């Protein structure tokens, strides 16, 4: 446990800030294509 302060892409590991969730779910939301 480190507090999710940042997000990480599963799909090419991807990772950006907490406040980055924008850009998380529509980065993720590329690989969904
Ligand atoms: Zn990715």
Redesign the pocket.
């Known amino acids: 446990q480190m507090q999710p302060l940042c997000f990480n892409?599963p799909?090419?590991?991807?990772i950006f800030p907490a406040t980055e969730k924008q850009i998380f779910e529509d980065?993720?939301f590329?690989?969904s294509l």
């Open positions: 892409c799909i090419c590991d991807k980065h993720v590329c690989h």
